[PDB]
């Protein structure tokens, strides 16, 4: 018919889906350094996903890993272990003005 008509196909400019910083990585309860990056330094409270930026699957894995590590004797509950205070800050929260 006509060569200039549009053709049916999938979006070629579609951007790849975004991935969480832990996408494709194993979350172990023994890796307390990683888990400590997702708790409050002052209270040890687990951060919600709106602060951690994790997907639902990894927010759950991190949460379950933290709870297991805490009660098995690997991780403190009421504060972030001071050894891990100088690790990369991956959470979106600021406590100082």
């Amino acid at each position: 018919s006509n060569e200039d008509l549009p053709i049916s196909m999938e979006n070629p400019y579609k951007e790849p889906l975004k991935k969480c910083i832990l996408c494709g990585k194993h979350v172990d309860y023994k890796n307390v350094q990683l888990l400590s990056q997702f708790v409050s330094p002052f209270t040890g409270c687990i951060y919600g996903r709106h602060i951690t930026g994790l997907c639902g699957k990894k927010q759950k894995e991190i949460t379950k890993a933290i709870k297991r590590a805490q009660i098995m004797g690997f991780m403190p509950v009421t504060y972030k272990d001071p050894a891990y205070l100088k690790d990369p800050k991956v959470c979106n929260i600021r406590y100082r003005e």
Binding site: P41, V77, P82, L85, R96
Partner: protein
């Protein structure tokens, strides 16, 4: 070096000192800020009591105890007895959200003590005892 709001960790080698004493050696001011009273106890790093004052021991009674100026007066009283025993710098550990939570700390400073840190130890049960039923007002 830049200022760190995180306290020095015991056993590590910090350079911070207060009158030649390390953080682990500074006495502790325990402030219990209740809804109807405020109790302040200053203790040494070894848990030796040095001074105790509360709004009740300062001549306040009933609803006047549960006020700021009443806690401020209790802080000044504890600071005075503590300063006589050789206390200048104190670590403050405050538990409770009563009206004398901050006012009790002002009294400690007006009494001649220098607060080097503030710690909250308000008890939060992680699931614990059932509190009393709500009030109908």
């Amino acid at each position: 070096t830049k200022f760190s709001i995180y306290p020095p960790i015991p056993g590590e080698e910090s350079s911070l000192r207060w009158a030649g004493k390390k953080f682990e050696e500074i006495p502790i001011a325990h402030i219990k800020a209740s809804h109807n009273n405020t109790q302040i106890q200053v203790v040494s790093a070894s848990n030796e009591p040095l001074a105790f004052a509360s709004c009740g021991t300062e001549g306040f009674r009933n609803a006047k105890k549960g006020t700021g100026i009443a806690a401020q007066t209790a802080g000044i009283a504890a600071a005075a007895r503590a300063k006589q025993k050789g206390v200048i710098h104190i670590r403050v550990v405050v538990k409770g959200l009563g009206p004398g939570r901050l006012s009790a700390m002002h009294g400690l400073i007006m009494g001649g003590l220098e607060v080097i840190s503030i710690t909250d130890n308000t008890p939060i049960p992680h699931x614990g005892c059932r509190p009393r039923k709500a009030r109908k007002l």
